Structures are given as C-alpha cells and as structure tokens.
Amino acid sequence: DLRLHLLLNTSVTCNDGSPAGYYLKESRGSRRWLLFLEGGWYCFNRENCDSRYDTMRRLMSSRDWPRTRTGTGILSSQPEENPYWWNANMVFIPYCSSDVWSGASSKSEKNEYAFMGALIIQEVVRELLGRGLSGAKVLLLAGSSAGGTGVLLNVDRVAEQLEKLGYPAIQVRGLADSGWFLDNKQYRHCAPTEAIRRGIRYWNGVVPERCRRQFQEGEEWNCFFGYKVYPTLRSPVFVVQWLFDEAQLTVDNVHVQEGLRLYIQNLGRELRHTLKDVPASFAPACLSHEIIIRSHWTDVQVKGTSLPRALHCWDRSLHPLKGCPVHLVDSCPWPHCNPSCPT
Numbered sequence: 001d002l003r004l005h006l007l008l009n010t011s012v013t014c015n016d017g018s019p020a021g022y023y024l025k026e027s028r029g030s031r032r033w034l035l036f037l038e039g040g041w042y043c044f045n046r047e048n049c050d051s052r053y054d055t056m057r058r059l060m061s062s063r064d065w066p067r068t069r070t071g072t073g074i075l076s077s078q079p080e081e082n083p084y085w086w087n088a089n090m091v092f093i094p095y096c097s098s099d100v101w102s103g104a105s106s107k108s109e110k111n112e113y114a115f116m117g118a119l120i121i122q123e124v125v126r127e128l129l130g131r132g133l134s135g136a137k138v139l140l141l142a143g144s145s146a147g148g149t150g151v152l153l154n155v156d157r158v159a160e161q162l163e164k165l166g167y168p169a170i171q172v173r174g175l176a177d178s179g180w181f182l183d184n185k186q187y188r189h190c191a192p193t194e195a196i197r198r199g200i201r202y203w204n205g206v207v208p209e210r211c212r213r214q215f216q217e218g219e220e221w222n223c224f225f226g227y228k229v230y231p232t233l234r235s236p237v238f239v240v241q242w243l244f245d246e247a248q249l250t251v252d253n254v255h256v257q258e259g260l261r262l263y264i265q266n267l268g269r270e271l272r273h274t275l276k277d278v279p280a281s282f283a284p285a286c287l288s289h290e291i292i293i294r295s296h297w298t299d300v301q302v303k304g305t306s307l308p309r310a311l312h313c314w315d316r317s318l319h320p321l322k323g324c325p326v327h328l329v330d331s332c333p334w335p336h337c338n339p340s341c342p343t
C-alpha cells in the first residue's frame, strides 16, 4: 500500500483550499522514482465547477481522502503485475485542481476556487527530496488522461526545478498515457479548444516556455495538444495512446454507415500520422478508455511486444536494439483489428 502525506506547505491547495498531497511507498536501495498524475477531466467556469463540487468532490478536495491506496498496474510492487518497475519508489499524486495540472492561482476574495496543479507538482517534488529523492538516478513523471496531458505540460519544469535546486544528476523523463488529443472537426456539432481557452484564463494556466514563445499571448491553448507541444520538449517522453480513444470520440460527438465509417478511419490515420516522428510510442488500434494503472495492463501487444517490454527497451536505449523495439504504432484501420485489445 501507498501511504498518504498531506503537503507540509498548506498554502498549496486543492480547489476548495484543503491541502493537496501525495501517496508514497518507498523502496530502500532503489534509485528509481515513479511519480504518477491522476486524471479526471476539468472544469472551466463557476457554474460547472460548482456542479463538479457536488458529485465529484474527491477531485476538488482532500477532506475525504483515505489514509492509504493500493498500487496497481505500473504502480504495483509485484513483478507478476508490473514487469517494468516493480522495485521502484512509488508516488501517486491525486488530481484535485481540475485544471489539467496547469494552474497557478490561489483562492481569495476574487477567486471562489484555487487552481494550483502546476504548483502541486513542484511542491511534491520539493518535499520528496528530503525523503530520498535527492539520491535518485531517474525520475519518471507519468500520468493518465488529464494526467497524461499534465506530463507534457510539466516534465520540463520538473527538470528545470531540480537543476536550479542543485540536483543535476537526476534524469527526468515523461510517460504520457491517453493524453495525446487532436483539435479536429467534430462528427456532429463546448469543444476542447474553446473550453481550454476559457480554462487558461479562469485557472491562470501556465504552459512550457518554448511552446509559449512559439504561439504567444492569447494562443497558449495550442500547447495542450500533444503533437504541438511535444517537439518543443527537451526531456525524453514516451507516448501511449489508443488510436480510437474514447475521450477523443466523446469530444468529437461520436457515440455503422458510410459517413461515420470514414470519420473513424480518418481519425485513426491522423493519430498515426502525428506519431510518425515520436521515437518512443505505443499506439494500439483499439477503442478504449483503459489506462496504465490497471492490473491487466500487461496484456495488450503491438507487433508482438507488450507495453512493459517497450518501456524496458526504452530504458536500455537511454543508457536501435536487436529484438527490443520502442516505436510501436498499429497500422490497421479499424478498432479491434488488433486481437489483443482490451475486452
């Protein structure tokens, strides 16, 4: 089990002003650290954040969090369930800021809610340095769904923070799961581009510096889209993305005749195209919302290679490799054309 620690700097808060936190299981002797960002959509104005507070309060507040959680999938400490990093130090960071991990704004007389996702990540890293992270060789910042987009937004800032604090030997890397979205046309027609544009203003959202300098003021929403922000990043990032992701289809208003068949096939081709120049990637031809912290994450294969194997080959590459591939993108054009897709 992973044990809850609420942040000692109680000014770094969840949406409602309660302290943010992290769950930790230490592994003495290991110099690998895995920090995982939870997902769960977002909210972008007073009215829709008020609704989220009524029926999704654990995503806005720490008041009801449990004292422990069980690590599963890539967060499991059992080699049978996690062939990749079962002996690592494990950290689960709850998503309680509703801002795709981008915010830097406190609750005040002008702000009903605090949006502090970017500061939560920084404060967790700072407090872990005194709990063993100072001795790390690799820090892998991972995350699923909104947490996967959060990895893309924050991995280079973690690297810069550790350099400025005097720890240049820790190698910072990212693993973005299910957070690589397209700003495409909907099948029928608040779209993500508009909702994110409003969210950035409401959250005081921040984006990576090189991407910000390309797109400039008013256009920072572009940096929330993986294919646009990825080429600006300096840290190594492994991208996991279903070709027919259910959250992508939801925002596209897809819930089969010729028009819809062509729409779905074109979506898969577009996603494949955006990954052509991403050297470390795993993209199966499945319709799914399943994520890498699920217990059976080992079961899916692309071209005969599982995700835990691909991640191990990635580790070796950062020391091509015979029989140890890292670029695994399906080419078949319809969901479940890969027989290993989740049931």
Ligand SMILES: O=C(/C=C/C=C/c1ccc2c(c1)OCO2)N1CCCCC1
Binding pocket: 039, 040, 041, 100, 144, 145, 146, 147, 149, 181, 192, 193, 196, 224, 225, 226, 247, 251, 289
């Ligand atoms: O958190 C999510 C999905 C969140 C999607 C977040 C998101 C959607 C569109 C975007 C974006 C981020 O930036 C670029 O455009 N879940 C979906 C399925 C599993 C439950 C959680």
Ligand SMILES: *[C@@H]1O[C@H](CO)[C@@H](O)[C@H](O)[C@H]1NC(C)=O
Binding pocket: 009, 011, 012, 119
């Ligand atoms: C607490 O966090 C806030 C926001 O990141 C920061 O301004 C302040 O310096 C922090 N204080 C300490 C003692 O870490």
